[PDB]
Amino acid sequence: RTVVETRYGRLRGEMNEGVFVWKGIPYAKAPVGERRFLPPEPPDAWDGVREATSFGPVVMQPSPSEDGLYLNIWSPAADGKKRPVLFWIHGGAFLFGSGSSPWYDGTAFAKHGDVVVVTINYRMNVFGFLHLGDSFGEAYAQAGNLGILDQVAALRWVKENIAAFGGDPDNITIFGESAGAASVGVLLSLPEASGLFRRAMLQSGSGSLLLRSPETAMAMTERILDKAGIRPGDRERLLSIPAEELLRAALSLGPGVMYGPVVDGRVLRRHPIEALRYGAASGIPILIGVTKDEYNLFTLTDPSWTKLGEKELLDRINREVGPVPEEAIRYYWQTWLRIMTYRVFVEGMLRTADAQAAQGADVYMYRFDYETPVCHALELPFVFHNLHQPGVANFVGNRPEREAIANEMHYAWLSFARTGDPNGAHLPEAWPAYTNERKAAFVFSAASHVEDDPFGRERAAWQ
Numbered sequence: 001r002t003v004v005e006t007r008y009g010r011l012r013g014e015m016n017e018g019v020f021v022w023k024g025i026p027y028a029k030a031p032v033g034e035r036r037f038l039p040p041e042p043p044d045a046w047d048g049v050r051e052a053t054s055f056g057p058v059v060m061q062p063s064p065s066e067d068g069l070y071l072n073i074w075s076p077a078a079d080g081k082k083r084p085v086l087f088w089i090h091g092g093a094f095l096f097g098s099g100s101s102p103w104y105d106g107t108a109f110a111k112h113g114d115v116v117v118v119t120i121n122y123r124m125n126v127f128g129f130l131h132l133g134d135s136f137g138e139a140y141a142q143a144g145n146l147g148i149l150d151q152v153a154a155l156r157w158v159k160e161n162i163a164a165f166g167g168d169p170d171n172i173t174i175f176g177e178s179a180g181a182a183s184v185g186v187l188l189s190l191p192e193a194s195g196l197f198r199r200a201m202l203q204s205g206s207g208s209l210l211l212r213s214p215e216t217a218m219a220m221t222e223r224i225l226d227k228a229g230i231r232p233g234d235r236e237r238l239l240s241i242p243a244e245e246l247l248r249a250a251l252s253l254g255p256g257v258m259y260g261p262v263v264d265g266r267v268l269r270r271h272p273i274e275a276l277r278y279g280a281a282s283g284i285p286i287l288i289g290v291t292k293d294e295y296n297l298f299t300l301t302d303p304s305w306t307k308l309g310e311k312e313l314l315d316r317i318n319r320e321v322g323p324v325p326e327e328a329i330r331y332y333w334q335t336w337l338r339i340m341t342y343r344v345f346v347e348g349m350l351r352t353a354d355a356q357a358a359q360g361a362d363v364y365m366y367r368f369d370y371e372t373p374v375c376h377a378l379e380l381p382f383v384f385h386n387l388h389q390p391g392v393a394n395f396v397g398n399r400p401e402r403e404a405i406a407n408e409m410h411y412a413w414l415s416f417a418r419t420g421d422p423n424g425a426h427l428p429e430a431w432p433a434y435t436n437e438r439k440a441a442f443v444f445s446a447a448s449h450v451e452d453d454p455f456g457r458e459r460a461a462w463q
Contacts, residue, residue, distance in 0.1 A: 136238060
């Protein structure tokens with residue numbers, strides 16, 4: 001029951017908590033040596049039965065190997081029963097993370113929902129998002145979005161092979177948090193991903209998050225190449241520099257470098273949210289939401305926000321997400337960081353929801369208000385029902401409460417993946433679809449409930 005055949009050969013998984021798991025499946029040829037900075041290519045086939053009982057390495061990151069394009073599968077049974085497939089794209093600011101994190105363990109989903117779960121690795125930071133333009137020749141023109149091409153490659157693997165693991169290739173839901181949700185927002189927009197998935201869920205991110213212009217990305221690349229000792233156009237040193245030195249050079253720039261997808265004219269031909277308005281994802285339902293006041297949580301990793309006086313503060317916010325109309329200021333560190341929450345998280349969520357609703361697609365919107373300890377999205381352990389995992393801020397107190405919110409969110413996400421509607425008796429009241437008409441949202445808290453257009457006042461202050 002543990003051995004499954006795929007287009008590339010047989011894989012041996014294991015039984016775990018009454019479900020089956022396959023770990024470290026290669027979904028692409030390792031992007032090492034002469035394949036460094038090139039789009040992912042199909043994996044080599046093998047003879048015999050390949051072990052899939054250990055995770056593969058994670059991709060290069062501060063935390064690893066350039067050989068890290070692996071995915072993992074949890075399933076109640078490798079049979080032909082066409083279960084919904086949940087395809088998870090982790091977050092980590094396009095800098096760190098992995099699908100093998102215990103936080104994303106798919107056991108609970110698979111057990112409680114009778115679904116297949118897939119988690120993936122994709123290239124990050126300087127290996128996945130180094131925008132080179134034409135500076136190293138046409139072969140590297142896609143380099144600024146390789147981590148997105150990796151995700152598409154994994155999704156193609158799943159569409160081609162998941163039936164063998166008990167999944168329905170025509171019922172895939174892609175979902176992600178933070179940079180993972182930005183990834184889902186990009187994929188929703190992408191012609192070459194259309195038809196690979198049926199539904200999408202975006203947790204505390206959207207296609208706008210961490211998105212770069214070519215001008216912005218090239219300037220960052222120039223600084224990284226300087227630190228790496230690589231002259232523009234020297235392909236020899238681009239491919240021979242040790243992966244750890246290249247990673248060090250980038251990280252040596254701190255915050256004057258952020259990674260993410262680039263509207264480069266080659267993989268991303270236009271803004272991923274604006275594309276939705278032209279019907280890029282017309283038949284695709286989405287479930288989307290945000291963590292209440294999420295930018296206040298960023299002071300933990302960046303306390304400098306708290307040091308600044310009101311004036312310095314506002315000039316900073318203006319430089320990062322401005323201009324800020326006077327009317328917004330009037331509506332409005334705790335008070336002024338609300339501007340960062342709205343511009344980075346809330347606006348892109350509302351623009352995404354408004355675009356899909358205008359296309360007639362179903363949209364379900366939420367706000368997560370539950371206070372729980374710490375891009376600082378907080379839904380994750382409740383959505384995965386992974387309150388018990390390592391790395392999860394599992395602290396004493398609140399246990400029945402935490403279980404109850406997990407039982408609301410976990411089963412809503414499962415219902416959405418199964419049917420395209422999160423509703424059912426696991427919710428204390430119905431969750432109406434978001435329409436231009438009412439702009440309903442579900443609020444997850446100690447007492448979950450529906451609010452009509454909760455973001456409206458703020459949004460009107462701006463728009």
